């Protein structure tokens, strides 16, 4: 009775891959979904539910490894780690990939309606252009908004320099004539229905919007942006360790990573898989940006209570000025 309990985001695997996995290995899959970071964390932390594989965001890997909730991966049981691009490994949230392996990755950027703008935006500063009066929706998050302001000034999105942060808030005030609203998930409706020209959001969200409206495009500012990852981990409540490693190995096979990327539509970290994608997909710099753009990306740093609070307060200052 070999089995595997997987805990993943909803709509985040090609279901046919689960069927292939079971047929090929004999391992049955008990599939469980979550749809927010917080819901996942609560069920893992509670400790009473067995999960063998989970697919957390980089933010949650930072949080869970510090609470000793993840099993350090046994690389002697892992096959195909060489298939993951070096640019996706040894990141700040999991140095040495002690606990995790990339599943999908992406960026923060700009989704725009080609028919509603003249020249396409290309850099964070383009959002400040006079032509974009009441035309932009911003992702509702302090790190995202303060980060793009920082980047627009040539500063790191992880800055802990008070003067840099003061300059960033002053710069964001000048963007207010162009901001229609600050929203999170609901941004997609406004873009899909052609109700707003530009939105700042993440590449997975953008990918989903683009599927529903042929006039939308996505760009990652080449100068700097945010890098995100969803990753495979083995929670400490694991009961089927052999099965967990089998699944990791299955998902590292380029043909499986390829099929998954085609189904979900997000950027694969599997380099051999990328080479086998359709030309139009592989060559799209919206989702497979160039080497220099990659080099300029930064993962969000885990801030202590002080700096989390400082960024939160600064974003509230910005929201006050929008009133």
| 255 near Cl ion, rule: CB under 5 A | yes
Region from 73-81, 198-206, 249-257, 289-297 binding Cl ion, contact rule CB under 5 A: 249-257
Nearest residue relative to Ca ion (C-beta): 33
Rounded least distance, CB 176 to Ca ion, Å: 6
Region from 57-65, 82-90, 121-129, 250-258 binding Cl ion, contact rule CB under 5 A: 250-258
Between 10 and 154, CB nearer to Ca ion: 10
Between 32 and 79, CB nearer to Cl ion: 79
Between 254 and 265, CB nearer to Cl ion: 254
- The binder of 48, among Cl ion, Ca ion, none, by C-beta within 5 to 8 A per type, is none
- The binder of 86, among Ca ion, Cl ion, none, by C-beta within 5 to 8 A per type, is none
Question: Which residue bears the tokens 């390829």?
Answer: 258
Joined together, the tokens standing for residue 318 give: 């910005």
- The binder of 254, among Cl ion, Ca ion, none, by C-beta within 5 to 8 A per type, is Cl ion
Between CA 209 and CA 202, with CA 311 as vertex, the angle to 5 degrees is 15
Q: How many alpha carbons fall within 13 Å on the CB side of residue 198?
A: 26
Cβ–Cβ < 8 Å for 250, 132: no
Q: Which of 22, 33, 158, 213 binds Ca ion (CB under 5 A)?
A: 33
Joined together, the tokens standing for residue 269 give: 């970290």
Between 243 and 259, CB nearer to Cl ion: 259
Distance of CA 269 to the CA centre of its chain: 12
- The binder of 185, among Ca ion, Cl ion, none, by C-beta within 5 to 8 A per type, is none
Between 197 and 264, CB nearer to Cl ion: 264
Rounded least distance, CB 133 to Ca ion, Å: 15
Region from 184-192, 196-204, 248-256, 288-296 binding Ca ion, contact rule CB under 5 A: 248-256
Q: Which of 11, 211, 242, 290 binds Ca ion (CB under 5 A)?
A: 11
Between 196 and 258, CB nearer to Cl ion: 258
Between 253 and 310, CB nearer to Cl ion: 253
| 236 near Cl ion, rule: CB under 5 A | no
| 10 near Ca ion, rule: CB under 5 A | yes
Between 82 and 166, CB nearer to Cl ion: 82
Q: Quick one: three-class SS letters along the chain?
A: CCEEEEEEECCCCCHHHHHHHHHHHCCEEEEEEECCHHHHHHHHHHCCCCCCEECCEHHHHHHHHHCCCECCCCHHHCCCHHHECHHHCCCCCCHHHCCCEEEEEEEEEEEEECCCCCCCCCCHHHHHCHHHCCCEEEECCHHHHHHHHHHHCCCCCCCCCHHHHHHHHHHHHCCHHHEEEEECCCHHHHHHCCCCCEEEEEHHHHHHHHHHCCCEEEECCCCCEEEEEEEEECECCCCCHHHHHHHHHHHHCHHHHHHHHHHHCCECCEHHHHHCCCHHHHCCCCCCCCHHHHHCEECCCCCCHHHHHHHHHHHHHHHHHHC
| 254 near Cl ion, rule: CB under 5 A | yes
- The binder of 207, among Cl ion, Ca ion, none, by C-beta within 5 to 8 A per type, is none
Rounded least distance, CB 234 to Cl ion, Å: 22
Site for Ca ion, rule CB under 5 A: 10-11, 20, 33, 255-256
Site for Cl ion, rule CB under 5 A: 253-255
């Amino acid at each position: 009775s070999q089995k595997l309990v997987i805990y993943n985001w909803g709509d985040y695997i090609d279901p046919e891959l689960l069927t292939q996995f079971t047929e090929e290995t004999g391992i049955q899959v008990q599939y469980e979904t979550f749809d927010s970071n917080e819901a996942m964390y609560t069920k893992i932390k509670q400790g009473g539910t067995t999960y063998d594989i989970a697919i957390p965001s980089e933010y949650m890997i930072n949080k869970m490894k510090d609470e000793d909730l993840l099993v350090p991966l046994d690389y002697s049981k892992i096959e195909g780690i060489e298939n993951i691009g070096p640019e996706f490994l040894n990141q700040s949230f999991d140095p040495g990939n002690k606990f995790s392996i990339p599943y999908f990755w992406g960026t923060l950027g700009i989704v725009y309606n080609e028919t509603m703008v003249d020249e396409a935006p290309e850099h964070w500063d383009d959002l400040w252009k006079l032509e974009y009066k009441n035309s932009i929706m911003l992702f509702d998050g302090a790190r995202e908004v303060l980060g793009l302001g920082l980047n627009s000034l040539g500063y790191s999105l992880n800055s802990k320099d008070p003067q840099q942060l003061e300059e960033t808030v002053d710069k964001l005030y000048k963007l207010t004539p162009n901001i229609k609203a600050i929203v999170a998930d609901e941004m997609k409706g406004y873009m899909i229905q052609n109700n707003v020209a530009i939105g700042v959001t993440f590449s997975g969200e953008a990918s989903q919007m683009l599927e529903k409206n042929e006039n939308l495009r996505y760009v990652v500012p080449t100068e700097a942006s945010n890098l995100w990852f969803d990753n495979m981990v083995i929670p400490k409540t694991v009961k089927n360790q052999d099965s967990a490693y089998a699944f990791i190995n299955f998902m590292l096979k380029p043909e499986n990573a390829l099929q998954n990327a085609e189904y979900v539509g997000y950027s694969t970290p599997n380099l051999p898989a990328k080479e086998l994608l359709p030309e139009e997909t592989k060559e799209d710099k919206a989702f497979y940006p160039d080497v220099e753009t990659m080099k300029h990306l930064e993962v969000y740093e885990k801030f202590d209570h002080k700096w989390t609070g400082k960024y939160s307060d600064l974003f509230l200052q910005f929201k006050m000025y929008r009133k």
